[PDB]
């Protein structure tokens, strides 16, 4: 039970959920693709991305932390810090 998350696995899953989102073309996306500057998304889209991250990994990200995760690497680092990966 309870398989341990790694940085590579979390990165794969976050980029995987973002490659299934029809407002992001999956060839322009990288780990540092900023959602408002590089990917050109709405703040509503950023909220929906963080809610899909919550539905993916199973834990709520609070709004004071949700309104600041603006690239996928920030999301991977946040899930890493809140789940203590690479023990």
């Amino acid at each position: 039970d309870a398989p341990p998350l790694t940085l590579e696995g979390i990165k794969d899953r976050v980029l995987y959920v973002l490659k299934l989102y029809d407002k992001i073309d999956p060839e322009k996306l990288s780990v540092n693709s900023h959602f408002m500057k590089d990917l050109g998304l709405d703040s509503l889209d950023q909220v929906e991305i963080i809610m899909a991250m919550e539905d993916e990994f199973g834990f709520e990200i609070p709004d004071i932390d949700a309104e600041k995760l603006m690239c996928p690497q920030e999301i991977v680092d946040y899930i890493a810090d809140k789940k203590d990966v690479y023990e």
């Binding site: 039970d1 309870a2 398989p3 899953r13 993916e56 990994f57 199973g58």
Partner: protein, 606 residues
């Protein structure tokens, strides 16, 4: 005689021996939970022999083996009562507990305090078998308070959680409110019948038994979570799933029902106590099964299921059928512990997910849990010739064909439909449909501990109603002549509940979004009862505990009247006496006034 009593006491001493082993320890254990599971399995096997030789002859006895204390006319002894109720309930409790502990060796495996958990679960089992085997009210009160305290310690297992401690203190609060009536009943029997033993209570046979039966009904209201004192049993789901499966489904919560069944020669001669039990049980089984229709946490739904079944047990005590109520206890234990174990298998397979709106598609992903959950739901609703058919249907056939409070019967039938409704709510949101759980699947149920522990209660939930209902002796006369609409009432109402709730479930896939009614908010917010009573009644106490009693009385007024007024008075008189100006003139003028008052006004020279 020598076989029966020996194996009777061997069961209890054998259950106490791992408590001595865990208290007399030095080493890190070579699987102490396997030791306790082997112990309870062998105690079940040992307890089956007095059960079988009770089935052969009806052999009952009383082991009053240790004289404890003689308060002048009250000889309190360690007195065990091996009658029908002990002889049937102790194997059922041991069998369920053996299943719960082989489940617990899987479920509580990540817990670093697993030995403390098995110790506490065995202490619960010891206190429950002190309760169900007791002959006097003091020893029954020992088992009563013991299962209450082990309920506290096992609800508040994860004690860094605020809600677990809150739920445990809530359970203690409601059970002490029941203990008011229990100690009322003990006081009545001591003062009026000079006894706590059941034999002298039954032989003196009191007629004016309104007040002790009201005390026993209050004790059963506290212990079996009846209406007025119900919400601690849905709060009690905050403890681990073996705790909710053993204690708060099948074994602990029947102790108030077992208390009123144990006093059946007094409830059979009191129509007012029967009407109180009937109305209270019908109220509880309506209210909790109505609350279960719209809940989303699966353990809350099964807790309202077991409280609705306890309300049904209180109903069938209220219609003067105590042995059918005890048969429904023994029947209910199997499938309700199994439904909680299936819920725990789902919760552990979905990574501590307990909500039914993040489930689904588990018909094939968890096939053994699906099979056992369907069999448990059909045993709950009263599928014919499963275990719940052999008591509950007969209960309905005795609740129809009797001089009954008709509104209580009608609410009992509405509750019977509601059972089918929430059972297929469980089946629809948990097993059927499509997945709603997160995307990393860790679904696995292939541990032989889990499989065998669900399997033995599955064999129970298939065959145990048949086997027990054909082994027990007749203690009443069964009503077996009734019209065809009245014989088919339980099955038809159950099928109509299934049909109506299938309609409700098929409307959930539709693209229609309505605002919720007051009926939904009443069924979902628990009849508004813990929202009111847990905010208002503590408030009115605690403010009175600080503004009135603490600050106003015992920091101000009781401090004002005796010590502060006296201290200020002596201070003021001290400042009057010593405020002299040192003038010799004034002191001698006071001396002359003294002599004049002494001679003329006081006459001290006559």
């Amino acid at each position: 005689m020598n076989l029966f009593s020996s194996l009777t006491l061997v069961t209890l001493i054998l259950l106490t021996m791992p408590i001595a082993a865990i208290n007399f320890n030095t080493h890190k254990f070579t699987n102490y939970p396997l030791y306790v599971k082997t112990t309870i399995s062998c105690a079940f096997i040992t307890s089956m022999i007095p059960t079988m030789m009770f089935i052969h002859t009806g052999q009952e006895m009383i082991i009053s083996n240790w004289h404890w204390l003689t308060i002048q006319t009250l000889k309190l002894s360690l007195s065990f009562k091996m009658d029908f109720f002990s002889m049937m309930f102790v194997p059922v409790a041991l069998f369920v507990t053996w299943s719960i502990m082989e489940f617990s060796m899987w479920y509580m495996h990540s817990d670093p305090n697993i030995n403390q958990f098995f110790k506490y679960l065995l202490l619960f089992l010891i206190t429950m078998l002190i309760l169900v085997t007791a002959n006097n009210l003091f020893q029954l009160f020992i088992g009563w308070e013991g299962v209450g305290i082990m309920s506290f310690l096992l609800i508040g297992w994860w004690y860094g959680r605020t809600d677990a401690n809150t739920a445990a203190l809530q359970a203690i609060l409601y059970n002490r409110i029941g203990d008011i009536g229990f100690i009322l009943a003990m006081a009545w029997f001591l003062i009026n019948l000079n006894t706590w033993d059941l034999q002298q209570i039954f032989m003196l046979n009191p007629n004016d038994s309104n007040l002790p039966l009201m005390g026993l009904i209050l004790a059963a209201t506290g212990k079996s979570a009846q209406f007025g004192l119900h919400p601690w049993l849905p709060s009690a789901m905050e403890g681990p799933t073996p705790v909710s499966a053993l204690l708060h489904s099948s074994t602990m919560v029947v102790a108030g029902i077992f208390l009123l069944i144990r006093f059946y020669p007094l409830t059979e001669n009191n129509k007012f106590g029967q009407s109180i039990m009937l109305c209270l049980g019908a109220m509880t089984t309506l209210f909790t099964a109505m609350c279960a229709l719209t809940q989303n946490d699966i353990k809350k739904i099964i807790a309202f299921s077991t409280s609705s079944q306890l309300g049904l047990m209180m109903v069938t005590i209220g219609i003067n059928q105590p042995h059918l109520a005890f048969l429904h206890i023994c029947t209910h234990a199997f499938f309700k512990a199994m439904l909680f174990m299936c819920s725990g298998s789902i919760i552990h397979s979905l990574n501590d997910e307990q909500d039914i709106r993040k489930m689904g598609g588990l018909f094939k992903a968890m096939p053994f849990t699906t099979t056992a959950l369907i069999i448990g739901s059909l045993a709950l609703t009263g599928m014919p010739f499963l275990t719940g058919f052999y008591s509950k249907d007969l209960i309905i056939e005795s609740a129809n064909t009797s001089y009954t409070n008709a509104w209580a019967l009608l609410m009992t039938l509405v509750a019977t439909s509601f059972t089918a409704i929430y059972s297929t709510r469980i089946i629809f949101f948990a097993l059927l449909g499509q997945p709603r759980f997160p995307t990393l699947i860790n679904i696995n149920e292939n541990n032989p501990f889990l499989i065998n522990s669900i399997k033995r209660l599955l064999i129970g939930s298939l065959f145990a109603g048949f086997i027990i209902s054909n082994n027990i002796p007749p203690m009443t006369i069964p009503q077996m002549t009734m019209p065809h609409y009245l014989k088919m009432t339980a099955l038809t109402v159950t099928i109509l509940g299934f049909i109506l709730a299938l309609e409700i479930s098929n409307t959930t896939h539709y693209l229609k979004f309505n605002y919720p009614s007051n009926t939904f908010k009443f069924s979902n917010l628990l009849g508004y009862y813990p929202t009111i009573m847990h905010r208002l009644t503590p408030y009115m106490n605690l403010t009175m505990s600080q503004k009135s009693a603490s600050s106003l009385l015992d920091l101000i007024w009781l401090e004002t009247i005796l010590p502060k007024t006296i201290s200020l008075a002596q201070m003021k008189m001290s400042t009057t006496i010593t405020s002299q100006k040192g003038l010799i003139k004034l002191y001698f003028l006071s001396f002359l006034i003294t002599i004049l008052i002494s001679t003329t006004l006081l006459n001290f020279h006559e």
